[PDB]
Design a protein around this ligand. Structure first.
Ligand SMILES: [Cl-]
Ligand SMILES: [Cl-]
Ligand SMILES: [Cl-]
Lengths: 173, 109
């Protein structure tokens, strides 16, 4: 049972990530649609904006770099900054009440040095107290629903039984 | 009509443990996804095959293999075993942050 829930005002899941590497476009689009109170951002268009030269055929395989996350943000009137680690429960609480969007940067949990890391971006939605414990609420673009994270943990248990480490965030959307 | 992707995995069984070979073999066969209208044909090819992919990692603990094609070394394919009639295929960009949803493929016959 939920004792307290604090989410971004106008956040709504509107599209879902399938066979492309556009998780940062999905996350930025959802955060910007939330803070700007619109439905006019979408993953495809953002990735197209980031990769003007790339053929339609090859666009699905384009991924996103940190500098693009910050510069795209700037073009939309947002001052984005990187923060290492997981944000605290109180920091998320303030940012969410202040209508400021947080993008999660996550990396797959690697078995040994030869096992390549996979990168994935997600959107923070807010925070909650559930059964007396502090939680962060997040949206994985692979999914059509929200997820719950122990605020004291950087280990994300994503759908399809995939674990990722939340290593840092881009704050300011 | 569906789109068909051939995946000719090139590797030398003499160099793999029995468990590594068992894991790769989980994925060999023909598989389909109705939503994408796309099918994949996974075989153990050889050095004169077309559509060659090489193995990057075999994860016996999680029943998962990662591999990539010489045609585009910037995309990593990740296959995960789901059950007897299904596998999951995911792609991830080698540079930058971006990894697809695992896509479910069901065994063709
Ligand atoms: Cl790596
Ligand atoms: Cl052995
Ligand atoms: Cl051939």
């Amino acid at each position: 049972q939920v004792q307290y829930e604090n989410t971004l005002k106008n956040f709504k899941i509107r599209e879902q990530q399938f066979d492309n590497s556009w998780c940062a476009g999905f996350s930025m689009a959802a955060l910007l649609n939330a803070t700007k109170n619109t439905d006019t951002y979408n993953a495809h268009d953002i990735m197209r904006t980031l990769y003007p030269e790339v053929s339609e055929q090859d666009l699905p395989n384009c991924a996103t770099f940190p500098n693009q996350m910050i510069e795209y943000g700037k073009s939309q009137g947002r001052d984005i900054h990187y923060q290492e680690g997981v944000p605290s429960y109180n920091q998320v609480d303030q940012l969410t009440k202040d209508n400021v969007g947080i993008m999660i940067l996550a990396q797959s949990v690697s078995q040994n040095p030869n096992d390549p890391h996979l990168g994935h971006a997600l959107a923070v939605v807010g925070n909650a107290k559930i059964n007396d414990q502090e939680k962060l609420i997040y949206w994985n673009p692979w999914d059509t629903e929200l997820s719950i994270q122990d605020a004291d943990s950087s280990l994300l248990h994503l759908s399809f039984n995939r674990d990722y480490n939340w290593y840092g965030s881009m704050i300011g959307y | 009509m569906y789109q068909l992707q051939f995946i000719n995995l090139v590797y030398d069984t003499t160099k793999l443990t029995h468990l590594e070979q068992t894991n790769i073999n989980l994925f060999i066969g023909n598989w389909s996804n109705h939503q994408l209208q796309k099918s994949i044909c996974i075989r153990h090819g050889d050095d004169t095959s077309h559509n060659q992919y090489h193995i990057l990692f075999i994860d016996t603990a999680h029943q998962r293999i990662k591999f990539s094609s010489f045609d585009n070394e910037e995309i990593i394919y990740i296959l995960d075993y789901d059950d007897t009639q299904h596998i999951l295929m995911q792609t991830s960009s080698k540079q930058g942050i971006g990894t697809s949803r695992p896509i479910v493929y069901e065994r063709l016959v």
